[model samples]
Target: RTQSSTGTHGGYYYSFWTDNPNTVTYTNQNAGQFSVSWSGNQGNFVGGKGWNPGAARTIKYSGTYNPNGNSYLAVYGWTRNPLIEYYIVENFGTYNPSSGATAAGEVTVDGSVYDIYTSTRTNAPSIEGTRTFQQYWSVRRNKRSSGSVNTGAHFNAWSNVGLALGSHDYQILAVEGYYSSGSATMTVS
Candidate 1:
């Protein structure tokens, strides 16, 4: 989710894709002038626009996870100054079973120890700058249930992360897990 301050003269734009073969799509439009596009499955956005004059910019960002997999977050904007071009990008490494865990447990992935979590949570991780942007790719895992037993598995959620920029061409990536607890892992490319 993206929100802008009243009277602010700037906007945000972004797009993303998931790791699954099927995809979900969503779009946002305000005042019949600005629009935002989102692909729920593939995590892709194709359009965004914002126009105002000489105002401090305030942008807030948030997202939801379907189950388990990888999610990509991105942000970008434009200025009234003809000579000034601004862009920013960030990729959250991954939200795996060990992302926000409280238990004394760990997952050994490629010789690395990651904290595991057993509940639903959010990681408001962010990076910001001007003319320069940051990027990250992260993973998430969803737990499974069989009768009275809890089977932690990993599945493809939605990997589409993006911003709300009007008429700007920006792209990002959001990966989904397999929907099974122990079947999901994150890798960087």
Candidate 2:
């Protein structure tokens, strides 16, 4: 049965959301680990430990991802005050998120290069509720299924580029799908 839920497991936070009324299964296994199977128009399932107010920290993760359509494996999070949503995309399938977006510039972090992109979401759903907000992206030039994200580096780079983040909210390593189908076994530490 397709369902959605959120909670903490072994000290990690996990959550799932689906737009499709009848298509998705998300399971939380342990701290920093989970599995998800979905055949839906849009949905997201994610697991990872995070802080209420985010901070610059090293986030390590790994996963075996098999995505049949448009999907992303990323570090996802939100902020307040300025209300920003952010994504540090690590891997994706069937769609290059950068296809239409112009790169503002690039930043190098953890010995890898990432293209920076920003877009505004007008009256879109947000952690603060449905409202206008900015979204920040740091998309790696090279995709990988396992690695560590030096989030402080990315945060600093964004600030240098005028993409200031607000007071941090919850952040998670996330698996997101849109107009797609996929499954993933993922871990974060």
Candidate 3:
């Protein structure tokens, strides 16, 4: 099933994809609470939930995500039709495999040094489609720092380094929770 909450269940369309039972509720746009107590590979999200590239925006957001499962707090987005997915990640449940991911260099955005990674995939992983493209990932220099992230700054960093997000937009603040157990909460504004 699909559900949404906009700081209150869907202000600018934040939602999730659950493998079992998960909750996406809001305490206030820029604030909410969620719990994931499912099992096996549930990559859930909350944010603009979509990306509109080349549009004039400085998408500023902040939140706290507490993970109980081996999950991750990822602020990511993509060009839906062109298919380039990018992520600004704050890895939570597991030791971040920085070296395992290819080094695509670094860019400075919003006064933070962000290390970029370029990756490719087949069929996009979730849905069974025969399409593939390059994916980008930028991890902040400081690990475990949470609260608010200015997504626009990351976008600028990508543009400065020559990665284009196409001419439409989609983005998300998601918890890619795999094999979940107790409760997990993510808040954003």
Candidate 4:
């Protein structure tokens, strides 16, 4: 069965989105905590909890993850004024996203070096409907399942590289799966 929904969980807005209608499930366990499971060949699922207007905060997350394919555990969000989507990728599966994007530079944070990159999305679905926008990325060199992300540091790094963010939308510690089967138990604070 395909299940997709969004609501308030533990005082934060949580969204569960899946491209394929079947073979996916989402569960909200507690405040800042959730789980997702999926099995499919051409499906994508993303689920998480966070503030509506995401700000620069030190986000801590810990979880058990088995992506089974292309997936990511990231601090993900979007902004409106510039209509941008962004990710501070902490852990990922076999795919190295940075390999496909233009490298802006690098920043050291959370005991690891992160390579920055930017890409554009045209007429893509976003927080403010379908629109063309830029997507910013900070992919960590080392992968780990649990850690603290100083989002402010990444924000500052982006600014240094001429990547500016606009009005905040929503931000979350997100577990994303693409064309794969996986399950995750995650909590963010």
TM-score top scorer: 4
lDDT of 2: 0.78
lDDT of 1 by residue, 1-189 (tens): 432222311233322222332343333333312322223433322223322221223332233323333432222333222212222222322443233423423343322332332322233222223333212212222221110100111101001222212222222122222222111111111
TM-score-best of 2 and 4: 4
Candidate 4 residue lDDT tens string, 30-89: 888898888875687888887788999999989898888888889999887878888999
lDDT of 2 by residue, 43-121 (tens): 5444344444567889888878888888888888988888988889998888876565556799988667899987888
Considering TM-score, which of the candidate structures 2 and 3 is the better prediction for this target?
A: 2
Question: Can you tell me which runs of candidate 1 are displaced by over 4 Å?
Answer: 1-24, 29-55, 63-71, 80-85, 90-189
Q: How many times do residue backbones clash in model 3?
A: 21
Root-mean-square deviation of each candidate, in angstroms?
16.2, 2.5, 4.7, 1.7
Candidate 4 residue 45 Cα shift, in angstroms, is 1.2
For candidate 4, the 10 contiguous residues with the lowest summed lDDT are: 93-102
TM-score for all models, in order of appearance? 0.25, 0.88, 0.67, 0.93
For candidate 3, lDDT tens digit of each residue in 71-124? 666776656555666778765666452446678678776556778877777776
Position 91, candidate 2: lDDT:
86
Model 4 ranges off by over 4 Å:
1-3
How high is the CA lDDT of each candidate model? 0.26, 0.78, 0.55, 0.86
Ranking of models by lDDT:
4, 2, 3, 1
Clashing pairs in 4: none
Query: Higher-TM-score candidate among 3 and 4?
Result: 4
